Structures are given as C-alpha cells and as structure tokens.
Amino acid sequence: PSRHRLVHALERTADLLDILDFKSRAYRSAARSLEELNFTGIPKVGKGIAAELSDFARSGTFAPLEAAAGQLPPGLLDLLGVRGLGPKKIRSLWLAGIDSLERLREAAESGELAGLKGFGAKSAATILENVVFLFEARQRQSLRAGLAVAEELAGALTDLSPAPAGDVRRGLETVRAAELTVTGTPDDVLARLPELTVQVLSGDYEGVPVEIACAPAEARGALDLLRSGEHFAGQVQAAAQARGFTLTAGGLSRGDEVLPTPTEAVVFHALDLPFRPAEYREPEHDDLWQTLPDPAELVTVGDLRGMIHTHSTWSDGGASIREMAEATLTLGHEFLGTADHSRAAYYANGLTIERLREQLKEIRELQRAGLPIVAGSEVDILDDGSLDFPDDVLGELDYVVVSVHSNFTLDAARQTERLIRAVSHPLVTVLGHATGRLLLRRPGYALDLDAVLGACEANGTVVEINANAARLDLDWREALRWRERLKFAINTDAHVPGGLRDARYGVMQARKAGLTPAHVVNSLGRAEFLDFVARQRAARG
Ligand SMILES: [Hg+2]
Ligand SMILES: [Zn+2]
Ligand SMILES: [Zn+2]
Ligand SMILES: [Zn+2]
Ligand SMILES: [Zn+2]
Structure with missing residues (x-):
C-alpha cells in the first residue's frame, strides 16, 4: 500500500x-x-x-x-539477491562472464573478481562472504555448486584417490552436500583439510556442506557402493544379506570370511550380480535399468557437435555472437545455435522484428568470415498459444525454439492448450525448457506434460533438456518415460561463454534417461542439422 x-x-x-x-x-x-x-x-x-x-x-x-x-536468466535472479551488488556491478559481472552464484564464488576464489574494474581484493571478499550466506540459507544445493566444491576438494586430496560420491556422483538435479570418497584414514584427510570434523568426516566449505568418507584400499569398493547411495545402498545391502554376506563400509564379509573389495566391480562379482552403472542407481531405475544402454553407448559432452539455444548481447546475454561462436569451437564443438529472445520478453531485451533483421545481417557476416553458425530465435509463446513472431519472420530462421516466459499462473487446462498449440506450429523445431521450473526458486507451472509431449511427438518437434543447472528440464524422469517416442536436444541456454560448459549437467540428466547420441539432435553436424529441420518441416502439413 x-x-x-x-x-x-x-x-x-x-x-x-x-x-x-x-x-x-x-x-x-x-x-x-x-x-x-x-x-x-x-x-x-x-x-x-x-x-x-x-x-x-x-x-x-x-x-x-x-x-x-x-x-530473466536464473543466475541473474540469483546475483540480484547478493547483498551489496548494485545494477552497474551486476552488469559488469555479466559482461565479464560471471553468470551465477557458483561462478561468482569461483571468481572470488581465483582473484578474477578483484581484477575487475570497481572490485578490489576487499570487495571481492565481502561479496564472497555474502554468497556464503545465500548458500547456507538453502536446504539443498544446486548440482553445480556441489559438483564444483567436490571437484575442488578432490584437488587437495590427490594422493588419496578422490572420487565424487552420493548425489553429485549420480547427477541429482539438487544435492544435499558435496560428497567425496577417498582411500586412507581420517588423519590422512585431516592433514590436507584441517577444517573438517570427524564423525567419515564432515564440514562446510564456503556455505556448501561437505562429507568425505574414507576406507582402506581393500574396502574402497564397498565404501563406493554404500556411498552412492541411500536408496541404492539399502538395495545392495539387502542383496548381500540375502546371500549370506554382510556389506559394510568396512568391507564385504561372510562369517569368518573377509573378501578383498578394491573396486565396485569386485563386490558385484562376489554377489553374482550384474554391474549396475551409477547412472542407473535411482529408485525409478529399479525395474528398468537392464533395458537401458551400456554406459559406453550413452551421450557425452563430446557428442554435442551443435551448441544451440544460446544468448548474446543482442538479447540478455553478456557476450557477442562472435565470442560465443569462438567459445563453442575452443570447447571442442562444431557449430553455434543463435537463439535470443523476441519482442514479448521486454525485461530480457527481446528483439523486435527490425532488430532481428539486423542480427541476421551480422550472422551472415560472421559466416562469410568462416564461423559455423545457425540462426535461430527463442520465440515467446503468447498466453493464447500463438507465437511472438509472424510466420514470414520465422521463415527467415534456420531453426525456431518456442518457450514460455510469461503467464505462469494460468489454470492447468489453459496452459496445456497453450503449449499444445505452440508445439503444433509448422515452423517450430524445439520446445524450450518445457516446465518453466527453476530449481530452488520456483516450481514449474501447472500443466499436463503428457498431453504436451504427445503433441510434440505428433508434430515431430524435438523437446529440450535444458542443461542450465537451475533448470535441468525436461526432467530426466519424464525423458526416461518418453525416450522411445521423442528426439531430444541437450541445450545449455548459455547467456555467457562459460555457460557453454553447462552441457555437462544436461548430459548427466540425459544419461540417466538412457539417451544415446542417436536420441539427441545436437549430435548432428551443421549440414546434417539444417536438413533434419527441413525434413522435420516437410513431414507436416
Ligand atoms: Hg577411514
Ligand atoms: Zn535470457
Ligand atoms: Zn525456402
Ligand atoms: Zn528461455
Ligand atoms: Zn533461452
């Protein structure tokens, strides 16, 4: 009032x-x-x-x-919550390639933050303090923070043969702690990380809860199984007891017998069980996992030739199209997919029709200069199901992504009709982050996903698995159910060059769903991609 x-x-x-x-x-x-x-x-x-x-x-x-x-991007919404960051600073962080709490925390760590105009050693430590507050508030951490912290601590535990464990190891979209596994004694760990407290050891690294469990070299294999863990741990112990063994972090036993357990594989052999890949150790896998591909067949970050659905300075990105294209090349990929917002996304600097035409001119120039680019747009879906750009404008593009960025509170039936209408368009190629969910901030809008996905199947429109750690959407659980009926796209939705390294998080989700390079359009080379969408569009009408 x-x-x-x-x-x-x-x-x-x-x-x-x-x-x-x-x-x-x-x-x-x-x-x-x-x-x-x-x-x-x-x-x-x-x-x-x-x-x-x-x-x-x-x-x-x-x-x-x-x-x-x-x-606005998830990471920007986060930075806007960091006490002490003004508009000008948040804008310079963005232009400097710092797009998330986790990436800000690393920038502080490395001196990169202090090295910016307007920041010095002192302000860089104040900001790190304020980020630590955001992290401690959360009950659960993002996969990005948990994985980054576990990777960093492993660095200090090199001769103890560190290995990610628990939630970070199997790619849980949200994570209870940075869990690590290690061979040696609590003193070995305590000597390289004095901070921790022995309970396994636990502690708190810059707001991120940490757990390190250790074991003798001969028990490591069993420790690794048990710390997978919770649901699976109970499963594998049940399996062991049912066969006369006792499985413990201390090792595998059988009355008097103490069987050497150096590797996970050895424990499975001892129980006469088929090896169950860490990717498939979720509850939803219990009855399915032997139907799914061998890990060596599943998609990897290296299988992603095309990096589509990225943002640039034209929209709400922090880098030019050239910087982004150069970036996708030095990361080992083949081509870049442009996809800035449209008209309707007003607070994200969406492109009018005229500005889009100007972007296309720039893209043509970069292509002459030998840069592998495919021109697209992330077209907003108006609240009635129609698209933000006219059909003739959509016709100039090499590919079209459709997405919801408004009206999250429509009733389920109205929302479902909206998305069915949008994915049924003749020119649409990909459905962006289907659910609109943002991990640790807001659930997705209410809709009937199965109806919408059915509409995708009927129109041959590919559904996106958004690799951004705050989205991870489509959820891997829904991808698992639909893996036979849809083609998917693992897209980073990068708003910054470093955002292209998020692909690794999308891939972790795709692998739990059992996806191979053949399920993912990104695995196609540039020219193969351009006629996939030509075939896709030819197959309708
Ligand atoms: Hg130990
Ligand atoms: Zn954006
Ligand atoms: Zn034509
Ligand atoms: Zn979007
Ligand atoms: Zn986007």
Missing part, C-alpha cells in the same frame, strides 16, 4: 531494465514524480505506469517485477 513502497518498485524496475531507456527512463521518471506528492492524474505516469500501480495497490504485487522474474 505505502506510496513510498510504490516508488521503490518503480525504482527497482528501471534498475532491472538498466542491467541489460524508453521505459527504463519512463519508470525512473515516474518514480521521481511519485516522490513529491502529498495515478490517472499524476504527471509522467502514462497509461502504462498508472494501471500497474492500481493493481499493485490492489493485488499487493507489482506486475512489471513478476514479468521480469519469468523472463
């Missing part, structure tokens, strides 16, 4: 638009007018600002900020 509160929301919207001038200025000026006032009458508050305020008074929720929550 407070009028001073309205001024703040108006002032926070201009700051958000500043991050990525005809409404940033419009919102900033409307804030300065509401200042000196002891909405339809107020100065400088056009039809726009007036209407939303009344709704803010009513609803108790400022519309423009809700729109932005749905349009």
Whole structure:
C-alpha cells in the first residue's frame, strides 16, 4: 500500500531494465514524480505506469517485477539477491562472464573478481562472504555448486584417490552436500583439510556442506557402493544379506570370511550380480535399468557437435555472437545455435522484428568470415498459444525454439492448450525448457506434460533438456518415460561463454534417461542439422 513502497518498485524496475531507456527512463521518471506528492492524474505516469500501480495497490504485487522474474536468466535472479551488488556491478559481472552464484564464488576464489574494474581484493571478499550466506540459507544445493566444491576438494586430496560420491556422483538435479570418497584414514584427510570434523568426516566449505568418507584400499569398493547411495545402498545391502554376506563400509564379509573389495566391480562379482552403472542407481531405475544402454553407448559432452539455444548481447546475454561462436569451437564443438529472445520478453531485451533483421545481417557476416553458425530465435509463446513472431519472420530462421516466459499462473487446462498449440506450429523445431521450473526458486507451472509431449511427438518437434543447472528440464524422469517416442536436444541456454560448459549437467540428466547420441539432435553436424529441420518441416502439413 505505502506510496513510498510504490516508488521503490518503480525504482527497482528501471534498475532491472538498466542491467541489460524508453521505459527504463519512463519508470525512473515516474518514480521521481511519485516522490513529491502529498495515478490517472499524476504527471509522467502514462497509461502504462498508472494501471500497474492500481493493481499493485490492489493485488499487493507489482506486475512489471513478476514479468521480469519469468523472463530473466536464473543466475541473474540469483546475483540480484547478493547483498551489496548494485545494477552497474551486476552488469559488469555479466559482461565479464560471471553468470551465477557458483561462478561468482569461483571468481572470488581465483582473484578474477578483484581484477575487475570497481572490485578490489576487499570487495571481492565481502561479496564472497555474502554468497556464503545465500548458500547456507538453502536446504539443498544446486548440482553445480556441489559438483564444483567436490571437484575442488578432490584437488587437495590427490594422493588419496578422490572420487565424487552420493548425489553429485549420480547427477541429482539438487544435492544435499558435496560428497567425496577417498582411500586412507581420517588423519590422512585431516592433514590436507584441517577444517573438517570427524564423525567419515564432515564440514562446510564456503556455505556448501561437505562429507568425505574414507576406507582402506581393500574396502574402497564397498565404501563406493554404500556411498552412492541411500536408496541404492539399502538395495545392495539387502542383496548381500540375502546371500549370506554382510556389506559394510568396512568391507564385504561372510562369517569368518573377509573378501578383498578394491573396486565396485569386485563386490558385484562376489554377489553374482550384474554391474549396475551409477547412472542407473535411482529408485525409478529399479525395474528398468537392464533395458537401458551400456554406459559406453550413452551421450557425452563430446557428442554435442551443435551448441544451440544460446544468448548474446543482442538479447540478455553478456557476450557477442562472435565470442560465443569462438567459445563453442575452443570447447571442442562444431557449430553455434543463435537463439535470443523476441519482442514479448521486454525485461530480457527481446528483439523486435527490425532488430532481428539486423542480427541476421551480422550472422551472415560472421559466416562469410568462416564461423559455423545457425540462426535461430527463442520465440515467446503468447498466453493464447500463438507465437511472438509472424510466420514470414520465422521463415527467415534456420531453426525456431518456442518457450514460455510469461503467464505462469494460468489454470492447468489453459496452459496445456497453450503449449499444445505452440508445439503444433509448422515452423517450430524445439520446445524450450518445457516446465518453466527453476530449481530452488520456483516450481514449474501447472500443466499436463503428457498431453504436451504427445503433441510434440505428433508434430515431430524435438523437446529440450535444458542443461542450465537451475533448470535441468525436461526432467530426466519424464525423458526416461518418453525416450522411445521423442528426439531430444541437450541445450545449455548459455547467456555467457562459460555457460557453454553447462552441457555437462544436461548430459548427466540425459544419461540417466538412457539417451544415446542417436536420441539427441545436437549430435548432428551443421549440414546434417539444417536438413533434419527441413525434413522435420516437410513431414507436416
Ligand atoms: Hg577411514
Ligand atoms: Zn535470457
Ligand atoms: Zn525456402
Ligand atoms: Zn528461455
Ligand atoms: Zn533461452
């Protein structure tokens, strides 16, 4: 209600638009007018600002900020929660390739943060402190933070033969702790990591909970099975007892017998069991996993020739198209897929039709210069199911991604009809992050996924497995159920060059679903890709 509160929301919207001038200025000026006032009458508050305020008074929720929550990248929404980061700093972090809490934490660690204009050693440590607060708040950590921390601590435990364990090892979209496995004694570990406390050892590394379990070389194999873990651990112990063995972190035994257990494989042999890959040790796999491909057949980051659905400076990215293309090449991939937002995504600097035409001219130039690029767009799905760009405009593109970035509160039946309509379009090639979920922030919108996926199958539209650690959507559980009926795309949705290294998280999800390079369009070379979508479009109408 407070009028001073309205001024703040108006002032926070201009700051958000500043991050990525005809409404940033419009919102900033409307804030300065509401200042000196002891909405339809107020100065400088056009039809726009007036209407939303009344709704803010009513609803108790400022519309423009809700729109932005749905349009902005997950990592940016995070940085906006780091106490002490102003608009100008968040913008310079973005342009510097720092796009997430985890990546910010690493930048602080390495001196990279301090090396930026406006940051020094001191502010870089204050920011690291403030990021530690965000992490300790969360009950569970993102796969990115947990995996990064486990990888870093392994670095200090090199001669103890470190290995990721538990949740990070099998790619849980969300993670209880940075879990590591190690051979040696709690003193060996305590000598390289004095911080920890012996309970296994546990502790807290920069807000991220840590657990390190150790064992003698001869028990390591059993320790690795048990720390996989919880659901599977119970399974494998049940299996052991049912056969006269006792499985413990201390090793595999049989009455008097103590069988040497150096490797997981050895334990399976001893119980006369088929080896069960860590990728398949979730509950949902219990009755399915022997139907799925051998790990050596599953997709890998190296199988991703085409890196599609990426963002640039044209939209709400932090790098030019050239920097991104160069980046995908030095990471070992073949070509880059452009895909900036459209018109409707206002708070994400979406492209008007005219600006899109300008982007296409630039892409043609980069191609002349020998850069492997395919031009696309992430077209917003309007609330009725129609697309943000006209058909003739969509026709200029090499490929089209469709996505929801607005109206997350439509009823289930309206939302389902909306997405079925969009994935049924003749020109659509990929459905972006189907569910709109953001791990640790907001659940996805209410819809009937099976109906929507069915519509994808019927139109041969490929469904995206968004590799961004805050999305990991389509969920691997739904991909597992539909692996026979859909083609998938493992897309990073990179808003920054380093974002292309997220592919590794999408791949971990794809492998649990049992996907091979043949299930994933990204495995096609550039020319193979361009006629896949030509065939895809020919197969309809
Ligand atoms: Hg130990
Ligand atoms: Zn974006
Ligand atoms: Zn044509
Ligand atoms: Zn998107
Ligand atoms: Zn996107």
